[PDB]
Amino acid sequence: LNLLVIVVDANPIWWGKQALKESQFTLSKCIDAVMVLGNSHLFMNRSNKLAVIASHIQESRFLYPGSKDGKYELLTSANEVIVEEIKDLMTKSDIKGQHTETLLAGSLAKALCYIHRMNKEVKDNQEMKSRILVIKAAEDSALQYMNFMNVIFAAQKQNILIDACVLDSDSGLLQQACDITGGLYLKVPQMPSLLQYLLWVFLPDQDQRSQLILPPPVHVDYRAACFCHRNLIEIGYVCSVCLSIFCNFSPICTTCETAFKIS
Template identity: 60%
Template sequence: MATEETGGLLVVVVDVNPVWWGSSKRKEKTSSTLPQCMEQIMVFVNAHQMASPQNKVAVIGSHANESRYLYPRKGSADIHQTEVLAQIKSKDGKYEQFAKVQSDVMKELKDLIARNPVVSHTDTLLSGSLAMALCYIKRMEKEAGVGQNLHSRILVIKAAEDSASQYMNFMNVTFTAQKQNVTIDACILSADSGLLQQACDITGGIYIKIPDIEGLLQYLLWVFLPPPSLRSNLILPPPIQVDYRAACFCHRMLISIGYVCSVCLSIFCAYSPICSTCHTAFKIKAAPLKLKKKKKSQASGI
């Protein structure tokens, strides 16, 4: 049966952690604000929709307290229904679809920040946002119908630092994306992310850390706008060395050498007689004594 191309689905996960965007250290390096960054992201999203009339897009905001769909908005109609677009009046010659996407994203972003005035912790809920992205991709693939091929990928625009406490959830999401043939790309605004390095390497995506946030749009259009099927024909930044360190289950620290439970494969930085995950008690066996080999007497020469 011949497959019918239905375009590509792009899910953009944006790190909107207010702790990072409002930190004084970030302001010393660059003057770019979250609204300015969102404007560049919206230009990239519109460019993706212009590439093909069948392309689809979704935007997820990853906050420190919750993850939320910025587009499509919760309870709204499908993003490609012509009835909804017909009700939107074009302003300054802007295409109605672009106006709807930008309006919905900014409204949901303002509501997300307004409803979370107090941040309980500084870690961005990135693993939860990626799980939401995979659920949305799975739903859109079911709605596409039999015989239709929907190429899906996820782009993560990350600002805050990694959280080792999300290691297990993050790796579960990564292997799920690999099984579903979903590519994960990463555009890093600040410190390098070892978790996203592993996710991009496992799923065949691109990982890049931009030197300046003000040039974000250039990297988005140059590196991440072409679909994965065309990247082999382009000259892209060279691949980086992936940090494959794992996070221990006891202190949530990235380690290179540790102890692994033989039952549940939990990782620990220090030895413990009982596994804290599956409560398995380990039996300590005494190492056998090594016998010293006797030196053979050398035969005397004649």
């Protein structure tokens, strides 16, 4: 079976900037598209299961743990729960000017541990191939690099595919993230037509991904930079303690305070 987890980056600052701009694309349509993708995923097979996570500057909250319109009961429950919970989360939110960058690393951490919990509870007879369909919508924060890298390595070890679906911006950190675990990376430029992309590129699971034509991966610039400047550097002088990329040879690296002996 397959356990899909959709990490929606619903950053109120950026999405409300769209709302002010009165652009055609809106967070409501984005949520509807993600809802449709989840419904189709569960449509694929009974054993398949999904989950949803919403991201905010403060925290990240799960959006998912008759036939009035003649509808399938389970997908009806999914529709109602996600709609109500997302409206609640967006309507109620404190204001903190100091912190406005969207949070994604913690959401991915919650996702990863959730997949671990499901993998433990599920019967050993059936093998579960989990996936994380990250949907970024705003620029990332510089301060989150270390934690995001740790969670990405945890995902690599645990065999989970981070399928990034960034839109309106190309986060080098997120593209680097998906490259490590081998997840696909699609940058949709036509936001109104986003859902056609998900039902074709992302929706197919790892089992059939290899035997299918999908957009080629984007080149990843694995840049390195000194802590002095944050500028690209091809030669780094790291020590045996900090393991920090530095600019030029120095008597002692500041972040270490070690008694380096010249030679």
